[PDB]
């Protein structure tokens, strides 16, 4: 895998961002993580949804450099959203969320599961530390 540059257009949710990628505006879904959501009327605004959403927003808005890293399988989902690992100043946003107890590791689909181990270790630590969702 390799990272490629991207430019923030807009943070939409904890797990969804609008980026300029290869000169086109595109919606990205963060690979392998589920955050509580602010949108979706199925539940509305879940608990920690605003926090997850604010965390992603600050992290990407305050970055010098944003990079996207596609995994080895499908690069878009059925909604046309890019499926990627997002990095803010070299720090993976998907992991940061999980490390802070603001996201769970998603149901995984090989072969898009390169960082699965890594994220699960972070999730286990946030649970051990009883952070946010785990409190």
From Swiss-Prot:
Q: Which residues bind Ca(2+)?
A: 15, 34-35
Q: Where is the active site?
A: 29, 37, 81
Q: Where in the cell is it found?
A: Secreted
Q: Where is this region: Disordered?
A: 115-135
- The biased composition feature labelled Basic and acidic residues covers 115-131
Q: Which residues form a coiled coil?
A: none
Q: Where are the transmembrane segments?
A: none
Domain of life per record = Bacteria
From the Swiss-Prot or TrEMBL record, give the protein name.
Nuclease A
Q: Which organism is it from?
A: Staphylococcus aureus
> What fragment of the whole protein does this chain represent?
89 to 223 of 231
């Amino acid at each position: 895998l390799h990272k490629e540059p991207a430019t923030l257009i807009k943070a939409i949710d904890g797990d969804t961002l609008k980026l300029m990628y290869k000169g086109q505006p595109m919606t990205f879904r963060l690979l392998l993580v589920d955050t509580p959501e602010t949108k979706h009327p199925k539940k509305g605004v879940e608990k920690y949804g605003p926090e997850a959403s604010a965390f992603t927003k600050k992290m990407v808005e305050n970055a010098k450099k944003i990079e996207v890293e596609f995994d080895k399988g499908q690069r878009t989902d059925k909604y046309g959203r890019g499926l990627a690992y997002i990095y803010a100043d070299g720090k993976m946003v998907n992991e940061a969320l999980v490390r802070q107890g603001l996201a769970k590791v998603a149901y995984v689909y090989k072969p898009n599961n390169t960082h699965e181990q890594h994220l699960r270790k972070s999730e286990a630590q946030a649970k051990k530390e009883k952070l946010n969702i785990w409190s």
